[PDB]
């Protein structure tokens, strides 16, 4: 019987790289790009997706303020430290006059878009959130909402009252899976979410976390090609983080490098897509956000959570830093973008379509 050599590594990357600069974007070029561990290739991957991130979203890094106003959910996810079963944290909400008046000191420090997540609080849901929305839109800047899977006529009332995008991250594309994860809920609830907030109007935000446990190097590649598929105006990545008063607490962390070479992905197969630097890739590894920027993500999201309750929003451990003040986060990210040579975006920074 006749022999069946492998191709050398070093010709195997440096094809796939090609492929990748051709745009084609086959499955097996997908997965060999994220099972390949060596650091010339990875460098070579990152120098693209940076020259794809500099030709079409441009020198602008977009600053979004995000206000986390409630720690209270009503789902369990089992990887979240917010999910309902943690006992082991005490729980807030922020008054609507707290948030909007919040909002309005982050637009005088300079953001351009508030962006308002939670729990899947119930208390304010819908008609709290739309009163709290009109009166960020009179303040002339983008809004984004990140609250979780509710009814249509909830989003439709949203946006009726001036949001402008939703961040709806997938987790994880593998049905299997999700549900495991997700224990109240499955992708297709998900799934069908994200459709109904296209179809109203919204700039819409997926993306995954990577690491979760039983998740595979074939499960990313369905990710990469769940985010392809739609097209989506945001994407937001980041590694699974174990939170030790959850199931997940002695599972692997999510790896860094891995995470990066999927914003890197990203940002070829969705060259004019806006991609977060997110606080998880900053969490993990000192500086995470910054070397994030030159790899492909072209957004940073500022922390604008106030004391008492920024220190609660817990969703894995080291995401907040108790050592400086509340209104640090909007001038420490503005000395970022200049130390590396960007600069903050000069409008919303809403998606464009330049590619093509
Ligand atoms: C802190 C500085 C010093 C060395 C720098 C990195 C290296 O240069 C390798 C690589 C080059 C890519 O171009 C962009 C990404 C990456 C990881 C850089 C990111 C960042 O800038 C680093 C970590
Ligand atoms: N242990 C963990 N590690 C890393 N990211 C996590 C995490 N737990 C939660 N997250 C991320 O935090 C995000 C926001 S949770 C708050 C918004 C909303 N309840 C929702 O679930 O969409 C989730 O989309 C998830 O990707
Ligand atoms: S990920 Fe979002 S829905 Fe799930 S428990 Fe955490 S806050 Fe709730
Ligand atoms: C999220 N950053
Ligand atoms: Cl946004
Ligand atoms: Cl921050
Ligand atoms: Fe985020």
Redesign the pocket.
């Given at each position: 019987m006749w022999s069946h050599p492998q191709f050398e590594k070093a010709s195997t990357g440096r094809e796939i790289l090609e492929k990748l600069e051709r745009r084609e974007f086959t499955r097996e070029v997908l997965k060999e790009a994220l099972s390949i561990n060596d650091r010339g290739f990875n460098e070579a991957l990152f120098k693209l997706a940076d020259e794809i991130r500099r030709k079409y979203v441009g020198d602008e890094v977009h600053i979004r303020a995000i206000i986390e106003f409630s720690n209270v959910?009503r789902k369990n996810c089992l990887?979240?430290?917010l999910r309902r079963d943690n006992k082991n944290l005490k729980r807030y909400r922020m008054t609507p006059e707290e948030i909007v008046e919040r909002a309005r000191l982050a637009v005088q420090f300079g953001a351009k878009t508030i962006v308002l997540?939670?729990?899947?609080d119930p208390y304010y849901m819908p008609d709290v959130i739309s009163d709290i929305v009109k009166e960020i839109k009179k303040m002339g800047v983008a809004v984004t909402l990140?609250?979780?899977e509710w009814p249509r006529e909830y989003y439709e009332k949203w946006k009726e009252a001036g949001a402008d995008r939703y961040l709806?991250?997938h987790?994880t594309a593998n049905p299997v899976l999700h549900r495991k994860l997700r224990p109240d809920t499955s992708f297709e609830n998900r799934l069908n979410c994200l459709l109904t907030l296209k179809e109203l109007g919204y700039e819409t935000g997926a993306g995954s976390?990577v690491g979760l446990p039983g998740q595979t190097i074939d499960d990313l590649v369905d990710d990469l090609l769940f985010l392809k598929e739609h097209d989506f105006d945001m994407v937001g990545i980041?590694?699974?983080?174990?939170?030790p008063d959850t199931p997940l607490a002695n599972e692997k962390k999510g790896d860094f490098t891995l995470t990066l070479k999927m914003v890197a992905l990203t940002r070829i197969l969705l060259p004019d897509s806006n991609i977060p630097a997110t606080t998880?890739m900053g969490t993990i590894v000192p500086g995470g956000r910054e070397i994030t920027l030159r790899c492909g993500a072209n957004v940073i999201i500022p922390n604008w959570t106030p004391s008492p309750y920024r220190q609660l929003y817990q969703?894995?451990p080291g995401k907040i830093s108790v050592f400086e003040k509340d209104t640090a986060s909007i001038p420490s990210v503005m000395k970022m973008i200049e130390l590396l040579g960007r600069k903050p975006g000069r409008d919303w920074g809403g998606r464009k379509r330049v590619f093509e």
């Open positions: 959910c990887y979240c430290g997540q939670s729990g899947e990140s609250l979780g709806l991250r987790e976390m980041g590694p699974f983080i174990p939170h998880a969703l894995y």
